[PDB]
Amino acid sequence: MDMLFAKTVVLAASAVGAGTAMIAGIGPGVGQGYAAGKAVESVARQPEAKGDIISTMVLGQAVAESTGIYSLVIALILLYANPFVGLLG
Amino acid sequence: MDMLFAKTVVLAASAVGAGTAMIAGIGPGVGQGYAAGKAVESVARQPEAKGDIISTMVLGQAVAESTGIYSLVIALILLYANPFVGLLG
Amino acid sequence: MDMLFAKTVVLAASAVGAGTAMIAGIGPGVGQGYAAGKAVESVARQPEAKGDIISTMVLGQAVAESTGIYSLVIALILLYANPFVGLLG
Amino acid sequence: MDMLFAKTVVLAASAVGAGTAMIAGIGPGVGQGYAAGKAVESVARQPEAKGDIISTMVLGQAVAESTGIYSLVIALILLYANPFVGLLG
Amino acid sequence: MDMLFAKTVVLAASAVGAGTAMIAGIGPGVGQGYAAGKAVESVARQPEAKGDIISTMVLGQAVAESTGIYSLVIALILLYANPFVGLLG
Amino acid sequence: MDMLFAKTVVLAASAVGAGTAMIAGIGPGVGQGYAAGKAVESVARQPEAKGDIISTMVLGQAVAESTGIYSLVIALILLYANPFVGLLG
Amino acid sequence: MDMLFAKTVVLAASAVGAGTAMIAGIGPGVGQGYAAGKAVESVARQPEAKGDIISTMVLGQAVAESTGIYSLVIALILLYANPFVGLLG
Amino acid sequence: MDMLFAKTVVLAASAVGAGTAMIAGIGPGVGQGYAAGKAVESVARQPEAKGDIISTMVLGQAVAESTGIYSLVIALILLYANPFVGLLG
Amino acid sequence: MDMLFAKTVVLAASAVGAGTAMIAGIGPGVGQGYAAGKAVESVARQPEAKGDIISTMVLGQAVAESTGIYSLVIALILLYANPFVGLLG
Amino acid sequence: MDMLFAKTVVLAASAVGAGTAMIAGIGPGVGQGYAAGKAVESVARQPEAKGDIISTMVLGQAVAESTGIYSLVIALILLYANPFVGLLG
Amino acid sequence: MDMLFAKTVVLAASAVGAGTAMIAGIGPGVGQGYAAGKAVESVARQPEAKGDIISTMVLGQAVAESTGIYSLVIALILLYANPFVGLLG
Ligand SMILES: CCCCCCCCCO
Ligand SMILES: CCCCCCCCCO
Ligand SMILES: CCCCCCCCCO
Ligand SMILES: CCCCCCCCCO
Ligand SMILES: CCCCCCCCCO
Ligand SMILES: CCCCCCCCCO
Ligand SMILES: CCCCCCCCCO
Ligand SMILES: CCCCCCCCCO
Ligand SMILES: CCCCCCCCCO
Ligand SMILES: CCCCCCCCCO
Ligand SMILES: CCCCCCCCCO
Ligand code: NA
Ligand code: NA
Ligand code: NA
Ligand code: NA
Ligand code: NA
Ligand code: NA
Ligand code: NA
Ligand code: NA
Ligand code: NA
Ligand code: NA
Ligand code: NA
């Protein structure tokens, strides 16, 4: 193989791999939306708990975000700091 | 490989990768719709908290939107600021 | 590669990418339908609140629509303002 | 490439793209069925709210339909007003 | 390309596209089954509402059916009124 | 292309298309099982309502079955009344 | 094409098609398990109505099984009464 | 084609088909786990029903297992009693 | 075909088939986690019945595990007791 | 085939197989998160049974982890103790 | 095969495998978001137990994170400590 062909196929696979990783983003959208619904329900019933409600919502939602960030980091590595092109030849 | 062939396959993979990333959009639609349902329930029950209900709904929904935006950004990079074509040759 | 072959494969991948992006439309249908169910249950108990119920339903449903629109925009770019064909050669 | 080969591969990809877009139809079926179930439960407890129940059900269900329509439009463009065949050569 | 080869690949893709579109049928089965479950609980508790329960169930279920029909129409077009074979050559 | 090659690839795609369509069967199993659970719950609490419970369960379940039948019909057409082999040559 | 090559590719596609159809089995497992859970809850509260509970559970579960059987039939046709090999040549 | 090539491709497709069929196992795990949760909840609230609870749980769970077994049987046929290799040549 | 080529493609397909079968593991994780949540709720309410809550939880969870084990067995057969390599030639 | 080509394709398939197995990890995340939510609500209600709540949560969550571990083991075998490379030639 | 071709295909498959493993991230986002919603609902009722609530939420969420981490580790091994390139030749 020539080197341009090698990079071409490794980078093409990297594009597919990056987009596939981003499918993980479904999870945080579902879970965080649930937490938001419960926060809405609680502050209508208890306006006085609005600090605790919102601070607790944000903490718990932040934890649920992490796997969306992991996928994003893997995608950005593949696009901008691609680790395979340097292993070639 | 010639250079037109190299770009052709890298850009074709980028189109597939971009569309695949957008599958993440399922999540925010599910979660944010749940939050909207709880907000509807709560206005009817306690009309006086409409202000808090809606502001809390929008904050929590904004957080649930983020992974849909991340996918969108990855797709737009692949289509409009493609990082692979410049690594070629 | 000749130029017709280059466009052919880039546009074929664009068709697949566009259709795949549209899978995101599952999410808004699920979430918005939930919000509609809660609106129905509340109108029934609390007709004095039909105003707020429906306006709140529509606002929250509008937010849940956004990722379905993002996919639609990516699909229409790929079909009607294709950004790859101009990068070729 | 000859022109018949170019059209053949672009149209074959368009067929796959169209069918894939239609997977979005899962969402409206799930969400609208939920809204129908809530409408049933309320007409039987509150026969006097049948007008508001059904009109609210239909409005909210109409909103949940939109992403199923978007996919259908993309599929029908690819089959009947295909935008790629004219970009060729 | 010869013309038999062109039709062969376009029709093969059409078969895959048609079957893929039919995956949408998951949605109506889930949503309509939910609506049926609510109708069952309701007639038991409020048998003097049977007429409304069942008529409301059927109306709301009919709306939830539509995206299953759209997929079916796309599949039957691809199999029986295939729009690509005539664009060839 | 020779004619045996043409039929071979069209029929191979038909087999894949048929099996893929059958994935729709997930939906009716989920929804109809829900309806069955509600029927069980109601006959235990209201044994004297068994008549309307079971007739309502079966009607609503029948409606939820339809998209599973549509997929089955598409699969059986592709296997036993294949519409593509006759369009060839 | 020779005839062994024709059968080889048609039967290979049939194996993939058969396994794919079997994915439908997810649905009955989910729905029937729900119905079983409701039956358990119900006998605990109404020991007396065990006869009806169980007979209703089994009837409703039988209906939810049907699409799992349809997929199984399509798979067994493709493996043991394959309809494509006889259309060849 | 030679005969070793024919068997190679039919058996490779059989391996993919077998693994794909096993995806059905998701369903019974979800449904049976639900039934187990309800059994747990009811042993607490009504300890005089432990016998009915567990026997009903196991019956209903057995029914929910069937589609996981069907997939398993199809996989084991493809691996150990492969029906395609004998149709060859 | 030579024999090394035959084994290579059969074993490559076996690796893909094995990994695909393992997707079934989603189901037990979902269902068993539900059962664990109900057990947590039933001990809190009745700390004194901890032994029958837990014995029922474990029995019902064991049943929900079975399809995860079936997939695991199919994967381990394909990797360590591969049935296809001996059918070759 | 030469031996480097044989290993190359078997190891490439092993990488795809390993990543696919890891999709199973969705299940434990969903189920274990449910169990955690129930533990949180139960310690709010009942601070006495906290030891029991947490010990029950951890036991039930451990059981729900197992299929995530099985996939992980299959992936690590394919990457670090690959059983196919030794069957070659 | 030459050695550059061998590495190229093994690394391209590794990119696809890595991205696919990251799909597991859906699970923790869903489950952890649920746990966050319950934590919100419970502080508002029981402000006095915020201690217990948040520490229990974080412990249970940490357990639900594990399979997202496993996928991440497999992806980072494939990208940065690739075990296949050294088995080659
Ligand atoms: C999924 C990986 C795509 C890599 C395709 C490269 C094809 C190049 C052919 O010359
Ligand atoms: C999924 C990546 C698609 C790349 C296909 C390129 C094929 C070019 C063949 O000449
Ligand atoms: C998924 C991308 C499809 C691109 C296929 C191009 C194949 C042309 C072969 O000569
Ligand atoms: C998914 C896109 C299908 C296009 C396949 C075209 C293959 C023609 C080969 O000569
Ligand atoms: C998914 C589209 C299938 C089209 C395959 C055609 C292959 C013909 C090769 O000669
Ligand atoms: C998915 C459609 C399968 C068709 C593959 C035909 C391959 C024949 C190659 O000569
Ligand atoms: C999915 C259908 C598989 C058919 C592959 C046949 C390939 C034979 C190549 O020579
Ligand atoms: C999915 C079916 C795999 C069959 C691949 C056979 C390829 C052999 C090529 O010579
Ligand atoms: C999914 C099965 C993979 C088999 C691919 C074998 C390709 C060998 C080509 O020479
Ligand atoms: C899914 C398995 C990938 C194996 C691809 C091997 C292709 C090598 C071609 O030279
Ligand atoms: C899914 C694995 C992608 C490997 C494709 C390699 C194709 C190289 C052809 O020369
Ligand atoms: Na997380
Ligand atoms: Na988010
Ligand atoms: Na949105
Ligand atoms: Na919509
Ligand atoms: Na509809
Ligand atoms: Na229907
Ligand atoms: Na059925
Ligand atoms: Na069953
Ligand atoms: Na089981
Ligand atoms: Na387990
Ligand atoms: Na875990």
**DSSP line for chain A:** --HHHHHHHHHHHHHHHHHHHGGGGHHHHHHHHHHHHHHHHHHHH-GGGHHHHHHHHHHHHHHHHHHHHHHHHHHHHHHHS-SSGGG--
* One-letter amino acid of H24: A
Measure the CA–CA gap between K66 and I24, rounded to whole angstroms: 18
Q: What is the DSSP letter of H83?
A: S
Chains that touch D (3 or more CB pairs under 8 A): B, C, E, F
Nearest to D23 by CA among B22, H47, B57: B22
Q: What is the DSSP letter of H81?
A: S
Neighbours of I48 (CB within 10 A): 8
Measure the CA–CA gap between C1 and C6, rounded to whole angstroms: 7
Measure the CA–CA gap between G63 and F28, rounded to whole angstroms: 9
Q: Which residue reads 């199993």 in tokens?
A: F29
A64 vs B contacts (CB less than 8 Å): none
CB neighbours of J86 closer than 8 A, spacing ≥ 6?
Answer: none
Measure the CA–CA gap between D57 and C37, rounded to whole angstroms: 7
Residues with CB under 5 A from ligand 21 (ion): I 28; J 66-67
Query: Token pair of I75, please?
Result: 């994967």
Closest Cα in chain J to K77: J79
Measure the CA–CA gap between H71 and I66, rounded to whole angstroms: 13
CA-derived radius of gyration, chain F = 20
How far lies H32's CA from each of D23, G8, H37, H60, I50, in Å?
28, 40, 9, 8, 22
Query: Token pair of B9, please?
Result: 């396959």
User: What distance lies between CA F60 and its chain's CA centroid?
Assistant: 16
CA angle (C55 as vertex; B31, K35 as ends), nearest 5 = 25
Task: Give the distance between the most distant pair of CA atoms in chain G.
Answer: 69
CB neighbours of H71 closer than 8 A, spacing ≥ 6?
Answer: G22, G25, H21, H22, H23, H24, H25
CB-nearest partner of H60 from G17, G57, G75: G57
Q: Which helix (H) or strand (E) holds E18?
A: helix E3-21
State the virtual CA torsion across F65, F66, F71, F76 in degrees, nearest 10: 100
Fold category of E1-82 in CATH? F1FO ATP Synthase (1.20.20)
φ/ψ (deg, to 5) at A81: -140, 55
Nearest to K83 by CA among G2, J12, J45: J12
CB neighbours of C87 closer than 8 A, spacing ≥ 6?
Answer: B7, B11, B82, B85
Measure the CA–CA gap between G23 and A24, rounded to whole angstroms: 22
Query: Is I24 in contact with H29 (CB distance < 8 Å)?
Result: yes
Q: Which residues of F45-68 are buried (b: 16+ CB within 10 A; e: fewer)?
A: ebbebbebbbebbbbbbebbbbbb
Nearest to B60 by CA among K49, C65, A30: A30
Closest Cα in chain J to I86: J87
Query: Is B47 in contact with C42 (CB distance < 8 Å)?
Result: no
CB neighbours of F68 closer than 8 A, spacing ≥ 6?
Answer: E25, E29, F24, F25, F27, F28, G66, G67, G70
* Residues in the ligand 11 pocket, defined by CB under 6 Å: A 9, 13; J 12, 16; K 9, 12-13, 16
Query: Is C70 in contact with A22 (CB distance < 8 Å)?
Result: no
Q: Which residue, judged by its Cα, is nearest atom 7 of ligand 9?
A: I9
Measure the CA–CA gap between E7 and B53, rounded to whole angstroms: 58
Measure the CA–CA gap between K59 and C46, rounded to whole angstroms: 41
Chains that touch E (3 or more CB pairs under 8 A): C, D, F, G
CA angle (I62 as vertex; I59, I67 as ends), nearest 5 = 150
User: What distance lies between CA B52 and its chain's CA centroid?
Assistant: 26
Question: How far away is chain G from the Cα of I52, in angstroms, using its nearest Cα?
Answer: 15
Nearest to G28 by CA among E53, E21, F32, D49: F32
Task: Give the distance between the most distant pair of CA atoms in chain E.
Answer: 69
Measure the CA–CA gap between E32 and K76, rounded to whole angstroms: 44
Query: Is H68 in contact with H32 (CB distance < 8 Å)?
Result: no
Q: How far is the CA of F11 from the centre of ligand 6 (A)?
A: 9
Q: Which residue, judged by its Cα, is nearest atom 8 of ligand 9?
A: I9
Query: Is A12 in contact with K10 (CB distance < 8 Å)?
Result: no
- Residue F9, ligand 5, Cβ within 6 A: yes
Q: Which residues of I9-30 are buried (b: 16+ CB within 10 A; e: fewer)?
A: bbbbbbbbbbbbbbbbbbbbbb
Q: How far is the CA of E27 from the centre of ligand 17 (A)?
A: 9
Query: Token pair of D20, please?
Result: 């894939």
Ordered DSSP codes for chain K: --HHHHHHHHHHHHHHHHHHHGGGGHHHHHHHHHHHHHHHHHHHH-GGGHHHHHHHHHHHHHHHHHHHHHHHHHHHHHHHS-SSGGG--
Measure the CA–CA gap between K46 and G14, rounded to whole angstroms: 60
Measure the CA–CA gap between E25 and F23, rounded to whole angstroms: 8
Neighbours of B4 (CB within 10 A): 14
Query: Token pair of C32, please?
Result: 């918005």
Query: Is C87 in contact with C4 (CB distance < 8 Å)?
Result: no
What 3-state class would DSSP assign to B82? coil
What 3-state class would DSSP assign to E8? helix
Ordered DSSP codes for J63-76: HHHHHHHHHHHHHH
Closest Cα in chain F to G32: F33
CA angle (B54 as vertex; B50, B60 as ends), nearest 5 = 145
Query: Is I87 in contact with H85 (CB distance < 8 Å)?
Result: yes
Q: Which of residues 11-70 of G touch E (CB under 8 A)?
A: 27, 31, 67
Nearest to J74 by CA among I24, H74, A66, I86: I24
Q: How far is the CA of G23 from the centre of ligand 19 (A)?
A: 13
How far lies G23's CA from each of D16, E26, F13, in Å?
20, 12, 18
For chain J, domain boundaries: 1-82
Task: Give the distance between the most distant pair of CA atoms in chain H.
Answer: 69
Measure the CA–CA gap between D65 and I74, rounded to whole angstroms: 41
Measure the CA–CA gap between A62 and A40, rounded to whole angstroms: 17
